[PDB]
Scaffold this active site. Structure first.
Site, PDB file in Angstrom:
ATOM      1  CG  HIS A 125      -0.666   9.729  -0.690  1.00 31.73           C
ATOM      2  ND1 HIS A 125       0.746   8.136  -0.954  1.00 31.73           N
ATOM      3  CD2 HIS A 125       0.217  10.578  -0.234  1.00 31.73           C
ATOM      4  CE1 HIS A 125       1.627   8.915  -0.932  1.00 31.73           C
ATOM      5  NE2 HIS A 125       1.285  10.117  -0.144  1.00 31.73           N
TER       6      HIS A 125
ATOM      7  CB  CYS B 145       5.779  10.214  -0.775  1.00 30.04           C
ATOM      8  SG  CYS B 145       4.696   8.742   0.556  1.00 30.04           S
TER       9      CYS B 145
ATOM     10  N   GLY C 204       8.557  12.009   4.268  1.00 25.63           N
ATOM     11  CA  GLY C 204       8.466  12.690   3.471  1.00 25.63           C
ATOM     12  C   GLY C 204       9.469  12.816   1.988  1.00 25.63           C
TER      13      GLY C 204
HETATM   14  C1  LIG Z   1       5.376   9.308   2.496  1.00 23.01           C
HETATM   15  C2  LIG Z   1       6.475   8.637   2.873  1.00 23.01           C
HETATM   16  C3  LIG Z   1       6.722   6.859   3.476  1.00 23.01           C
HETATM   17 CL1  LIG Z   1       7.861   6.712   3.241  1.00 23.01          CL
HETATM   18  C4  LIG Z   1       5.529  10.652   2.200  1.00 23.01           C
HETATM   19  O1  LIG Z   1       5.629  11.832   2.087  1.00 23.01           O
HETATM   20  C5  LIG Z   1       4.067  10.676   2.598  1.00 23.01           C
HETATM   21  C6  LIG Z   1       4.252  12.449   2.772  1.00 23.01           C
HETATM   22  C7  LIG Z   1       2.381  12.989   2.802  1.00 23.01           C
HETATM   23  C8  LIG Z   1       1.641  12.645   3.221  1.00 23.01           C
HETATM   24  C9  LIG Z   1       1.616  11.372   3.960  1.00 23.01           C
HETATM   25  C10 LIG Z   1       0.229  10.024   4.095  1.00 23.01           C
HETATM   26  O2  LIG Z   1       0.804   9.608   4.769  1.00 23.01           O
HETATM   27  N1  LIG Z   1      -0.784  10.381   3.660  1.00 23.01           N
HETATM   28  C11 LIG Z   1      -2.051   9.460   4.132  1.00 23.01           C
HETATM   29  C12 LIG Z   1      -1.103   7.929   4.298  1.00 23.01           C
HETATM   30  O3  LIG Z   1      -0.825   7.143   5.670  1.00 23.01           O
HETATM   31  O4  LIG Z   1      -0.949   6.878   2.994  1.00 23.01           O
HETATM   32  C13 LIG Z   1      -1.425   5.436   3.272  1.00 23.01           C
HETATM   33  C14 LIG Z   1      -3.017   9.460   3.539  1.00 23.01           C
HETATM   34  C15 LIG Z   1      -3.724  11.091   3.854  1.00 23.01           C
HETATM   35  C16 LIG Z   1      -3.901   8.327   3.369  1.00 23.01           C
HETATM   36  C17 LIG Z   1       3.240  10.743   3.266  1.00 23.01           C
END
Ligand SMILES: *[C@@H](CCCl)C(=O)c1cccc(C(=O)N[C@H](C(=O)OC)C(C)C)c1
Ligand SMILES: *[C@@H](CCCl)C(=O)c1cccc(C(=O)N[C@H](C(=O)OC)C(C)C)c1
Lengths: 302, 302
Positions: free
Chosen positions: A41, A145, A143
């Site tokens: 993602h 992820c 951040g």
């Molecule tokens: C995720 C940490 C969650 Cl506890 C994280 O660090 C992160 C970094 C960059 C982008 C996202 C993100 O949310 N992307 C979307 C999403 O919400 O996931 C379902 C995408 C656009 C689908 C998370």
């Protein structure tokens, strides 16, 4: 003496963490040999998050679209590919700090250490268990992820988890290092939610043995029970069924304490039916189920 | 989201751990620059443990009496000295992995990470708090002496604890890196025991703020209290007095949640007087006091 939620020493993992940026999206990656692993993602943007087609998104990228930073050193991306929900970025430098490692998928009820990271910089280390419903109750902020979960056995790091998202109840979901999700979750925006969960019975019994080894005995009794009768009670309290294999796995702890497994099960039945009457076990006022039999043996052997 | 007992990443410390053997006694040491620090009781034997005179014991040793092993490399001891209850072994090699570091002594109520080690090999990492009675509730087995406690701030490791012994209640005692004991304990065999302890009020309030930040709100109420009235209740329940400085330290968390400190104190008073009526806070059924305001801000800021 003493019983703590203990994580593995994180240094081997710390030397693998990097930052991956695609466009304005940044997250953590795992650098092993000449490959960087991270959630796919990272290539998605706010506009596509509902029904992204990741194959289309990736075909439209080139190596120069990925910035990988390992400390203050920029790693040159020389290839990119996807494997399930993980992105593999081939870089022109093998990580000199790569530990001996394995990619292993874990079972619900098993535990692992999590190295929380931000911007490729480790921040903290803690123990987690994979819940029966395939979520984990982590501690993760924006951040995080790409942070990974792992176990260490004789200098070999078995990676088992990469962090992808937070569900609406505040619990966490991700994949194995091959990019296959744990549970019925997906890397896109839906109304997905954690399913019903249950308590990990074998782990609760392991922890009661830990407590006995550490001198908490007040919950013991002269009674025994059959496995069948015990499991009737378990089902009533949303505890998982106990199997003969679980009883066998508890054999060593049973032998060390002299308390038969079905005797300790009689104790657990009384605790479920009566509560603790204001007492604690190993400093907890509830029954703890995130220690495996192995975790207890590791920390209590002496 | 989520709140876990989180330790600092241990890698910087892991690269400092070594094994120290004197005679048939072995324990862990901490190798920084060209000095190895370890408990001086490594030079004592079973026959002298009652009233050892460490100055006599050390004068009778020479450098060759100390074996220091860093992994599979033997370090040549070229000097030895004592500082309070720690032994300093000068070796002929500066540790190439020495981090930026400080030796700091911590206050009761402060937290730190512990890297449990055996035979100079790290085994696990966990968080601890120095109790008001200067003990720590660790997890330590035979051979863990010389394991250290530390905090990390921007790549500088502040070492605050070296492990020396286990008291009869199963809690732990040790020193600062200058060899000065925390509490009224000594490195010899006596009937010494942990004194009475108390709960760290400011930390419990910090953790209630953590809980609010993570969506647990059931214990909130419309009431407030004065500091004086609150402290009357605190004293009744063996909680430490809350000071205006504690209230000031809680200012940021108060401002983030919109809950005045003395309002949250009204909640704590109700919880002490009534229990939890079967509910939990951040997955605990008791009031947790081993998170400082700083710990909460670190893990909850997002
Ligand atoms: C995720 C940490 C969650 Cl506890 C994280 O660090 C992160 C970094 C960059 C982008 C996202 C993100 O949310 N992307 C979307 C999403 O919400 O996931 C379902 C995408 C656009 C689908 C998370
Ligand atoms: C201490 C860990 C305690 Cl949790 C440890 O690893 C250790 C190693 C070697 C020797 C001792 C020891 O017990 N020494 C005696 C003692 O009991 O301390 C009071 C000496 C002889 C006084 C401990």
């Amino acid at each position: 003496s003493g019983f703590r939620k203990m994580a593995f020493p994180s240094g081997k993992v710390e030397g693998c963490m990097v930052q991956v940026t695609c466009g304005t999206t940044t997250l953590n990656g795992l650098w092993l040999d000449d490959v960087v692993y991270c959630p796919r993602h990272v290539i998605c943007t706010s506009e596509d998050m509902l029904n992204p087609n990741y194959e289309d998104l990736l075909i439209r990228k080139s190596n120069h679209n990925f910035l990988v930073q390992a400390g203050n050193v920029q790693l040159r991306v020389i290839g990119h590919s996807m494997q399930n929900c993980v992105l593999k970025l081939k870089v022109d430098t093998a990580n000199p700090k790569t530990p001996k490692y394995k990619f292993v998928r874990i079972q619900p009820g098993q535990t692992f250490s999590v190295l929380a990271c931000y911007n490729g910089s480790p921040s903290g280390v803690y123990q987690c268990a994979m819940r029966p419903n395939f979520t984990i109750k982590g501690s993760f902020l924006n951040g995080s992820c790409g942070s990974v979960g792992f176990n260490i056995d004789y200098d070999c790091v078995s990676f088992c988890y990469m962090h992808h998202m937070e569900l609406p109840t505040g619990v966490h979901a991700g994949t194995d290092l091959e990019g296959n999700f744990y549970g019925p979750f997906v890397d896109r925006q839906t109304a997905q939610a954690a399913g019903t969960d249950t308590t990990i019975t074998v782990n609760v019994l392991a922890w009661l043995y830990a407590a006995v080894i550490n001198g908490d005995r007040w919950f013991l009794n002269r009674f025994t029970t059959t496995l069948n009768d015990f499991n009737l009670v378990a089902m009533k309290y949303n505890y998982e069924p106990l199997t003969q294999d679980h009883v066998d796995i508890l054999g060593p702890l049973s032998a060390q304490t002299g308390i038969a497994v079905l005797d300790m099960c009689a104790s657990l039945k009384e605790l479920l039916q009566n509560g603790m009457n204001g007492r604690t076990i190993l400093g907890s006022a509830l029954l703890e189920d995130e220690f495996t039999p192995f975790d207890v043996v590791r920390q209590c052997s002496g």
